[PDB]
Amino acid sequence: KLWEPGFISFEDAIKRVSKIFINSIINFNDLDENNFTTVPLVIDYVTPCALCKKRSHKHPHQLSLENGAIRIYKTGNPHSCKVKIVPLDGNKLFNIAQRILDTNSVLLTERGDHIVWINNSWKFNSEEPLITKLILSIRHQLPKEYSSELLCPRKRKTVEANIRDMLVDSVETDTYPDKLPFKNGVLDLVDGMFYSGDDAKKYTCTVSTGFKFDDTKFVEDSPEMEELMNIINDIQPLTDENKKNRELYEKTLSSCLCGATKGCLTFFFGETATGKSTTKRLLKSAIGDLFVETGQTILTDVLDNPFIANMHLKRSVFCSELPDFACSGSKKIRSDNIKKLTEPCVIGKINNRNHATIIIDTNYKPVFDRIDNALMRRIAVVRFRTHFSQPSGREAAENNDAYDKVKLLDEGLDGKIQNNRYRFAFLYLLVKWYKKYHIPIMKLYPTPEEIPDFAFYLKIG
Amino acid sequence: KSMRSNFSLTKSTNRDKTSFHIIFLDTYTTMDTLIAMKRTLLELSRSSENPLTRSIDTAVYRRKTTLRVVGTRKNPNCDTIHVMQPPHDNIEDYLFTYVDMNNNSYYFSLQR
Numbered sequence: 001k002l003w004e005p006g007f008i009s010f011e012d013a014i015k016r017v018s019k020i021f022i023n024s025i026i027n028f029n030d031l032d033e034n035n036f037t038t039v040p041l042v043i044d045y046v047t048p049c050a051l052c053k054k055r056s057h058k059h060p061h062q063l064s065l066e067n068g069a070i071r072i073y074k075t076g077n078p079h080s081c082k083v084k085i086v087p088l089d090g091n092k093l094f095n096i097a098q099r100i101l102d103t104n105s106v107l108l109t110e111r112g113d114h115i116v117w118i119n120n121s122w123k124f125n126s127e128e129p130l131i132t133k134l135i136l137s138i139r140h141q142l143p144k145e146y147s148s149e150l151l152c153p154r155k156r157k158t159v160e161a162n163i164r165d166m167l168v169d170s171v172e173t174d175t176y177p178d179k180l181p182f183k184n185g186v187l188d189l190v191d192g193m194f195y196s197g198d199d200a201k202k203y204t205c206t207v208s209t210g211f212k213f214d215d216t217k218f219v220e221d222s223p224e225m226e227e228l229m230n231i232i233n234d235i236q237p238l239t240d241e242n243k244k245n246r247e248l249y250e251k252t253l254s255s256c257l258c259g260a261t262k263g264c265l266t267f268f269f270g271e272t273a274t275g276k277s278t279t280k281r282l283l284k285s286a287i288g289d290l291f292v293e294t295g296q297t298i299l300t301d302v303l304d305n306p307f308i309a310n311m312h313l314k315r316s317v318f319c320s321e322l323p324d325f326a327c328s329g330s331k332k333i334r335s336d337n338i339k340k341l342t343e344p345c346v347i348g349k350i351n352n353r354n355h356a357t358i359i360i361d362t363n364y365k366p367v368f369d370r371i372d373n374a375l376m377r378r379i380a381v382v383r384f385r386t387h388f389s390q391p392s393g394r395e396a397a398e399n400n401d402a403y404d405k406v407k408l409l410d411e412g413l414d415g416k417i418q419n420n421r422y423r424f425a426f427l428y429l430l431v432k433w434y435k436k437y438h439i440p441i442m443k444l445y446p447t448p449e450e451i452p453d454f455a456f457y458l459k460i461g
Numbered sequence: 462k463s464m465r466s467n468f469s470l471t472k473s474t475n476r477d478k479t480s481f482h483i484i485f486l487d488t489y490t491t492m493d494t495l496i497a498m499k500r501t502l503l504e505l506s507r508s509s510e511n512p513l514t515r516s517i518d519t520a521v522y523r524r525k526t527t528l529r530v531v532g533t534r535k536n537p538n539c540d541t542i543h544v545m546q547p548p549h550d551n552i553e554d555y556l557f558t559y560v561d562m563n564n565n566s567y568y569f570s571l572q573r
């Protein structure tokens with residue numbers, strides 16, 4: 001017995017090898033389980049040989065059995081013909097699926113979802129699964145005998161089913177807090193290095209700012225950098241009185257790049273026309289989709305809710321215009337949220353990861369229904385004291401004690417920042433401040449000695 | 462029209478392996494034409510999306526072509542047998558070697 005019938009029926013293997021030989025086989029009948037490695041395969045070369053593409057072959061071919069496969073080789077001159085291989089075990093689609101998983105292009109997270117690696121970014125979808133798009137994208141990275149058969153849609157559905165049924169164990173995503181993900185790579189914050197390609201693959205970053213990183217703008221000098229300092233100097237004066245507030249502001253600004261849990265909530269306190277919304281727009285333009293504006297519901301309306309589920313993996317949540325909770329007809333901050341919005345996992349798939357710096361802007365000092373010592377530890381406030389008013393009412397603002405300086409309003413800044421003019425210079429400033437403060441540790445300190453409501457407790461003390 | 466309008470089908474007794482033979486009665490040609498066809502048959506098998514188009518046995522196209530006769534066992538120790546099928550109750554409709562060129566029948570051959 002020269003054949004081991006542990007792989008495939010000998011008749012089926014002979015049928016396969018005959019199908020490979022387009023030319024008619026002369027002695028097909030005498031091939032049995034005890035001679036197929038011995039008798040040469042004489043072939044009537046009516047058509048060109050299916051292996052060497054020549055008119056004919058001087059000598060007959062021969063078969064060998066090795067490694068669970070059939071090796072087809074020509075006698076006489078070996079280099080005159082191409083060696084051929086017939087496999088016997090495995091559905092070819094299963095081999096393709098094994099190769100595709102083998103690349104680590106498709107993974108599953110703890111959410112029972114499947115993330116893929118298309119166009120240098122970890123794509124993900126739930127309504128329309130996109131494993132098959134990955135298969136199209138990756139067919140170029142496989143031999144020809146796989147690319148030729150990855151085209152038919154039903155074969156791709158079969159390969160997708162195989163991949164689904166082989167990806168058992170879950171991987172953890174977004175473990176690097178000091179990496180800023182774009183759509184074309186990841187920027188490292190500890191260094192100034194940018195990784196674009198397979199280098200960004202190792203950091204399983206499933207979110208992105210939404211715009212491509214450009215090395216021609218992220219230099220330092222910039223056409224826009226100088227007036228960006230002018231604007232930041234005007235909004236926050238570089239003075240000895242407004243000194244501590246300056247680095248507090250810079251720390252709050254930089255804490256929006258780190259992808260970890262933040263231990264404080266910052267209040268932008270200032271009067272009208274102080275530039276708080278200017279900073280809001282600058283951050284939005286600088287970090288793309290990582291910045292999100294929410295409503296007042298997550299402060300005054302019960303959490304468990306799209307406004308609490310969309311903050312999943314967002315690195316900055318900004319709250320706008322608390323409507324004078326000090327006066328009547330208002331709902332207080334209800335500090336239970338302050339208990340809730342800082343602890344690492346947000347309930348509201350009801351579990352989401354919290355990487356967001358929460359910044360709330362206000363014109364009036366806000367009040368809580370209950371004041372506790374845990375509120376002492378997680379609240380900081382930023383004071384804004386520069387006025388950008390129209391030429392008409394400058395004096396009426398220069399005689400107000402709520403402002404330390406009044407500046408002439410420029411009507412063109414909103415359109416320019418909306419055009420992402422200061423998009424990269426401001427990001428450069430953010431990185432510079434991050435290296436200045438958040439290396440090697442990121443943590444935020446509260447300022448209990450600023451909110452007037454906390455004075456009474458200090459009066460108790 | 463000759464091959465579509467008149468044909469017969471055989472059914473095998475093996476259910477796990479669907480084995481079938483279709484014989485078009487009103488079409489006749491020489492065997493070298495079949496051998497030359499084998500090429501285009503292989504390309505059609507590789508290109509068509511129909512699952513049955515994969516499972517055509519082109520290796521049967523060989524000198525002294527042999528096929529199991531209807532009503533006869535494949536092997537003495539095997540019980541897979543090709544049986545009669547309606548509406549064709551004539552065994553002559555299941556023999557490709559039988560030649561009956563009528564007015565509806567068409568014959569063709571290679572120029573060379």
Ligand SMILES: Nc1ncnc2c1ncn2[C@@H]1O[C@H](COP(=O)(O)OP(N)(=O)O)[C@@H](O)[C@H]1O
Pocket residue numbers: 230231232234235270271272273274275276277278279388389407408409410411413414
């Ligand atoms: N440094 C500056 N130079 C000129 N105009 C400036 C400025 N800083 C801010 N502004 C403008 O003055 C206004 C103050 O900014 P805004 O963010 O709206 O203030 P606010 N209402 O939130 O206190 C805006 O219209 C802004 O475009």
Ligand SMILES: [Zn+2]
Pocket residue numbers: 049051052053054056057074080081082
């Ligand atoms: Zn050859």
